[PDB]
Design an enzyme around this catalytic site. Sequence first.
Site, PDB file in Angstrom:
ATOM      1  N   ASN B  74      -4.833   5.797   5.123  1.00 52.23           N
ATOM      2  CA  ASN B  74      -5.914   4.810   5.186  1.00 52.23           C
ATOM      3  C   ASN B  74      -5.455   3.444   5.713  1.00 52.23           C
ATOM      4  OD1 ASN B  74      -8.553   3.590   4.515  1.00 52.23           O
ATOM      5  ND2 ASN B  74      -7.371   2.560   2.911  1.00 52.23           N
ATOM      6  N   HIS B  78      -9.240  -4.527   9.206  1.00 52.88           N
ATOM      7  CA  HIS B  78      -9.039  -5.970   9.243  1.00 52.88           C
ATOM      8  C   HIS B  78      -7.608  -6.338   9.616  1.00 52.88           C
ATOM      9  CE1 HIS B  78      -9.167 -10.100   6.974  1.00 52.88           C
ATOM     10  NE2 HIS B  78      -9.112 -10.234   8.287  1.00 52.88           N
ATOM     11  N   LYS B  79      -6.671  -5.999   8.736  1.00 52.17           N
ATOM     12  CA  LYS B  79      -5.264  -6.306   8.963  1.00 52.17           C
ATOM     13  C   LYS B  79      -4.729  -5.780  10.284  1.00 52.17           C
ATOM     14  CE  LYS B  79      -3.184  -7.418   4.504  1.00 52.17           C
ATOM     15  NZ  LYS B  79      -2.312  -8.502   5.064  1.00 52.17           N
ATOM     16  N   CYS B  99       7.136  -1.901  11.182  1.00 51.19           N
ATOM     17  CA  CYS B  99       6.831  -1.590   9.789  1.00 51.19           C
ATOM     18  C   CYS B  99       8.118  -1.047   9.164  1.00 51.19           C
ATOM     19  CB  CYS B  99       5.691  -0.569   9.695  1.00 51.19           C
ATOM     20  SG  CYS B  99       5.656   0.672  11.002  1.00 51.19           S
TER      21      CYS B  99
END
Lengths: 151, 151
Positions: B74, B78-79, B99
């Site tokens: 998920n 937005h981010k 990441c």
Amino acid sequence: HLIPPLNFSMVDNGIFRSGFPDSANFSFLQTLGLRSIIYLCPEPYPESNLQFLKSNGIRLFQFGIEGNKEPFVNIPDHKIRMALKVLLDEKNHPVLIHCKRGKHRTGCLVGCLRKLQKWCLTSIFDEYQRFAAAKARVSDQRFMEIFDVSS
Amino acid sequence: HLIPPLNFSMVDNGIFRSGFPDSANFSFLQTLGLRSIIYLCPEPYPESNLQFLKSNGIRLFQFGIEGNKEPFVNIPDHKIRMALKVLLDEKNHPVLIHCKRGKHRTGCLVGCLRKLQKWCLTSIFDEYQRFAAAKARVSDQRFMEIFDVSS
């Protein structure tokens, strides 16, 4: 919609790499500021493609390197060098490096480039294998484990 | 010798991607002369990694995204929309939308960029896996398929 050629990817700053380009890849390709092409195959350039090649201020450098399967291979140190020679000429960029699947042949030149760029064989061979996907050769990597430099 | 970070790769001019940077890579990171970096993990940057940041004058924009496995993935639209904004500001380049592993989250936004760039879901997806590998996920790509490019 744009369609990068097979296994397309951006090598270093102004260098590109891909398996083997075709018509569906022209639009996208016709954007990279292609000043020249590094084609690593001992076969003639497909007419459809070649049409684009010329009428684009794109020079072609074809260092034909025979391609045989892993059971028994052999990389032309010389040819690769003549290519690594042109590739290193800033005046040639932007260039696209390519052969058939863009995994082995295009693997050495880029791999070697990285070597001269002072990368660790470990992180180097990793990039090599990141592309080879299905088939990934060991011989091509050793060929690089021992790539001596002039300078 | 230089050691690029985990799954390092030059996405485009100014843009980069990889996993969580490790001290054993810094020397290489200095090569890039990074101006900014897009972060996607919620955990706070460590001690060393952060030292380098300042010790090298690199601006850090963070957009913590949760990290779940294939069963239940998920991504926060937005981010992502935001980080995509930072990435689009030339002023920020150099960058690195990294990441923890540089497979999913990184690839997601790195993929959504390709979407804006008018690529193709497939040519976009093949690139995506060229980093996730045996740990590739449909969920992410689906996110991409959906993500709207109406700025």
